[PDB]
Structures are given as C-alpha cells and as structure tokens.
Amino acid sequence: NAMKAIIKEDVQASLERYADRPVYIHLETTTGMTVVAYIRNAKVTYHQAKIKGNGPYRVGLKTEEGWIYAEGLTEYTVDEENRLLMAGHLPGGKLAISLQISEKPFTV
C-alpha cells in the first residue's frame, strides 16, 4: 500500500518518462471483487500521454495505432522497479480500476 493520492504533475512527468519506447501495460477493472476486463502485459509504445482532471483523474495514452484510456484514478506510486502504478476505487459504486506501466513484464 505505498499508494498515495495522485499528484497530477508527478504522474504526468512519470508518463512522459515511458513514452517512445516499448513498455508493458496492465489495465484491469473489477466490481462487486470479480474481474470484469483485464489486459496484462500488452506490449505497446505510446508517443503522447496525458493525465487530466482534478480528482479523480483520467489517463490517456496514444499508442502506435490505438489508444489506452483509464478514468477514475485517484492514487499512485512508482515502485522500486520504477513501475508506475495507478489505481482508483469507488466504494459507493463498487468499481475499481488499475493502470500500471513497466519497462519489463509484470509477474508476481
């Protein structure tokens, strides 16, 4: 739980860090928890990235020929492996989301 409330500018700086080179992505949505949609270790290269909103937040990544988008993000951290981990959880709607970016495949 090194997760901390999102600091917009720090996340933006972190996203630009991983732009223009191949990275692995984990994008998952859960509900009430049961998994709804899940993509793990999708390999992509994005050239533009932006975190928007004032809380919760939404992140959009423009890939080679597509898009990766996540809304409802409220917390994050950059771990010892330098992986940008972001997440959000709405206790009322019982909805959770996770978007993680790493230079290496996600395992355990």
Next chain:
Amino acid sequence: NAMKAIIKEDVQASLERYADRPVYIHLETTTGMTVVAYIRNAKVTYHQAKIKGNGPYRVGLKTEEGWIYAEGLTEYTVDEENRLLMAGHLPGGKLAISLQISEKPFTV
C-alpha cells in the same frame, strides 16, 4: 444491433480463427454511460483462446507474453468485415463490456 445471444461453440470457432496471426483488439468497460477502461487497436497475436461459462460468458486469450480477459459477455456477431464483436450489459449493476477482434484497425 446484429448482436445475438452467444452460441458458445460458434464463438469458440471464431476465436480460433484469429489465433496465431496479428489482430487488433478493442476492449472497453463502461458504467452508469461513462467509459471506465478502454484499449483500442492494441495489436496482439494470441496462441490459445477459450470462451467459458454457461451464460454470461468469459473469454480468455493468451498472448505472446500476456493475457486478455473479459467476463460478462452475453451477445455477439461476426460482421460483414469478418470482425468478431462481443458484448455484455448488466442493467442492474449498470455495467457494460465490449471485446472486439479484427484483422484490421477499428475506425468508425
């Protein structure tokens, strides 16, 4: 709305059709609708694929070095462009999901 109730064996046959060659994927989850998670035109090559359950259904695709998974699918079709379109909608929980596979990028 050419969407029709899922026929497990037909979907399975369709999934195996796109296995082992590069395809484009659209995977999206929405709620109450507002988009929650979205990946459009992710390019992947999956070697194993299976639709499970008895209704709703869940589809798992094993990619080169990751996974694509969607639960709550109830309807589908294969359109004129030979694209496998699948979706599910839970009016009670106000949750929707879409998983689409195509040999070409998704546009309009």
